Amino acid sequence: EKSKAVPFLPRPAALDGSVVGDVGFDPVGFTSWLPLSYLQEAEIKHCRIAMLATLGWIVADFVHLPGAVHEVSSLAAHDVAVKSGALAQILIWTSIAEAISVIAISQMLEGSGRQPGDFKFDPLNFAKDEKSLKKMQLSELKNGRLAMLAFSGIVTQAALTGHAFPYM
């Protein structure tokens, strides 16, 4: 009762405390008719994709790969990269990763034990015990949400005003 985020709204009844980044924020009750693991996986995937996208947009408006095709702004880079076939390679490998993801999310939903977003990818450690893993999961979630909103703002401002890196 009385979820932490919205103090005047009831607790979403599906987010008690046992999830990283769980401040009880679900006013429209998306968790009431969708699996929690599915939504967590979707959120983490969005976080990672948008973090990479924000970093790439900002960097590519500064540094360009050698070649005349890579001499466009990130706003206009989509139509150039799709014509050159640059985005085709990313599409192919992302589709391979996403088919393996289809298998992984199916197994997670039907038992297994794989945590949402846990691909066990960890060449370095950066997370030795449970406490470090929880803290870094919270950091990843917060940074990913911030980067999703940041990429949203960057794209909207750049489309509104065709400016360089300062999209004001």
């Binding site: 009762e1 009385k2 919205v6 103090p7 005047f8 709204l9 009831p10 006013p27 429209v28 509104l160």
Partner: protein
């Protein structure tokens, strides 16, 4: 048995004494509506939202007309017509404000319906007391009465300002003198 405000009318059944500003002024018996998701809880929440919105709007009109606009913002003293001048030059501000108000209003409606269902939240309550001006009781009732009276007065005032600006196309205090 008779309403305090209207002695020629019987006391409205649903308005005993609880809500701040209750004087029994329900001649049409609207407090007894229990249909289309509308009841005393919904009516009180709507009244409080109207009170707060009217207070904010009246304060904004008076502030802008007396102390002038903020730097970088248009002038004209007609608040119903300066809106189109702001939108003509800063449409993004208006759009962002509208989107924020839309999200907050969706949250407000969800909260109203939930609090009506599992009764734990008083109508118009959003737990918004950052400065702790209404922590203790015996002052909360007085603050509720002050808010309700000021909000009704500002509702009437803001409706008047809207109509005056739409019709006369002049400022509020311009109409005053």
């Amino acid at each position: 048995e008779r309403s305090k405000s209207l002695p020629f009318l019987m006391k409205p059944k649903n308005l005993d004494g609880s809500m701040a500003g209750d004087v029994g002024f329900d001649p049409l018996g609207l407090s007894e509506i229990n249909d289309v998701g509308v009841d005393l809880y919904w009516l009180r929440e709507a009244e409080l939202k109207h009170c707060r919105l009217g207070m904010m709007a009246a304060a904004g009109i008076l502030f802008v007309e007396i102390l002038g606009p903020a730097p970088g913002f248009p002038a004209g003293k007609s608040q119903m017509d300066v809106f189109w001048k702001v939108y003509a030059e800063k449409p993004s501000l208006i759009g962002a404000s509208l989107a924020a108000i839309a999200i907050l209003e969706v949250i407000s409606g969800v909260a109203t319906t939930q609090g009506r269902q599992n009764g734990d939240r008083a109508p118009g309550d959003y737990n918004f007391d950052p400065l702790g001006f209404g922590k203790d009781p015996a002052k909360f009732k007085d603050l509720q009465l002050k808010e309700v009276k000021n909000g009704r007065l500002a509702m009437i005032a803001a409706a008047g300002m809207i109509l005056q600006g739409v019709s006369t196309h002049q400022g509020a205090l311009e109409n005053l003198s």
